[PDB]
Design a protein around this nucleic acid. Structure first.
Ligand SMILES: [Mn+2]
Ligand SMILES: [Mn+2]
Ligand code: NA
Ligand code: NA
Length: 327
DNA sequence: CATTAGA
DNA sequence: TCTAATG
């Protein structure tokens, strides 16, 4: 966490590098796992050789260790960190709609900056075309003070169309968090459960409203259960317009609400921890349900859930408020 | 890891 | 149909 972190970081740097810039899946994978294991090791790795003892720790990483150990650096790190083409990729990628593949592809075409990107709007896709267009606002955080104003409208339009809906804004937001980077709207409806062969219109109604009002300004991608877009709080009585926000609405079977909600809400460590627990308590957790374990080694059958409580009751745990699901 | 674009 | 990208 702090004793071995050093190694860790260069590792991931190392991994990330092969993974994006180059296309070395393998070495990438290889940087990672050692990266993992070195992480758990209970002592100061004092040498490559000592690390070397570790599984997935090869001659090639042990070597990386020593350069780093003796010299607080690593040329391979410096050489890259430097790499104008390399750096070039990593930057691009921040545009939303841009992955490793496009970054590389774009690069070679000579596009290695935001302006180039602009210059060539044509070679760009809707999604990225958006990402471009709000590049600034997307990287921007979201002051809860806004999360709340956003949340409020969501709920009202949600409600205005059909009284039967049920939305939830999960995550850190929910978790209480001062600022958030995107609002995640969990949504269900009773006329929609596991079987009841959809209702595409279910999502489309809302999306439809939100645009109707102006909250929704763009569609990153609108699917039959997952809409992806952006939204903007109506800029006041002037002098202060609002920043463009990534929004995410999605259709949930009413029969799985609470779990996904419980889940989506985090923290990645809260869940991991609970989920771990229920295992003991004779269960199985996961983004859509909670089933009971059969000694066979396995077993199913999704218990019924009416609120995050059931799930709580179920594993006979303490009702943890969203505020304190920190870990 | 599943959902969506797009080619 | 795949393969990229989001989360
Ligand atoms: Mn794309
Ligand atoms: Mn999100
Ligand atoms: Na080894
Ligand atoms: Na990106």
């Amino acid at each position: 966490e702090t004793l071995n972190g050093g190694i860790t970081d260069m590792l991931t740097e190392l991994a990330n590098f092969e993974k994006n810039v180059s296309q070395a899946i393998h070495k990438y994978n290889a940087y990672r796992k050692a990266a993992s294991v070195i992480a758990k090791y209970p002592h100061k790795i004092k040498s490559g050789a000592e690390a070397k003892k570790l599984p997935g720790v090869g001659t090639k990483i042990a070597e990386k260790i020593d350069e780093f150990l003796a010299t607080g650096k690593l040329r391979k790190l410096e050489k890259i960190r430097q790499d104008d083409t390399s750096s070039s990729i990593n930057f691009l990628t921040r545009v939303s709609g841009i992955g490793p593949s496009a970054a590389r592809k774009f690069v070679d075409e000579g596009i290695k900056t935001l302006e180039d990107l602009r210059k060539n709007e044509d070679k760009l896709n809707h999604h990225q075309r958006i990402g471009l267009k709000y590049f600034g606002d997307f990287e921007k955080r979201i002051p809860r003070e806004e999360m709340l104003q956003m949340q409020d409208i969501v709920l009202n339009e949600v409600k205005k169309v059909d009284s039967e809906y049920i939305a939830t804004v999960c995550g850190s937001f929910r978790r209480g968090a001062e600022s958030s980077g995107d609002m995640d709207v969990l949504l269900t409806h009773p006329s929609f459960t596991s079987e009841s062969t959809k209702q595409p219109k279910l999502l489309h109604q809302v999306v439809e409203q939100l645009q109707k009002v102006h909250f929704i300004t763009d569609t990153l991608s609108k699917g039959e259960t997952k809409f992806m877009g952006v939204c903007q709080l109506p800029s006041k009585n002037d002098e202060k317009e609002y920043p463009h926000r990534r929004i995410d609405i999605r259709l949930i079977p009413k029969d799985q609400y609470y779990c996904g909600v419980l889940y989506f809400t985090g923290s990645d460590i809260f869940n991991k921890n609970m989920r771990a627990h229920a295992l003991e308590k004779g269960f199985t957790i996961n983004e859509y349900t909670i089933r009971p374990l059969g000694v066979t080694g396995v077993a199913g059958e999704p218990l019924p859930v009416d609120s995050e409580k059931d799930i709580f009751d179920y594993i006979q745990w303490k009702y943890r408020e969203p505020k304190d699901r920190s870990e």
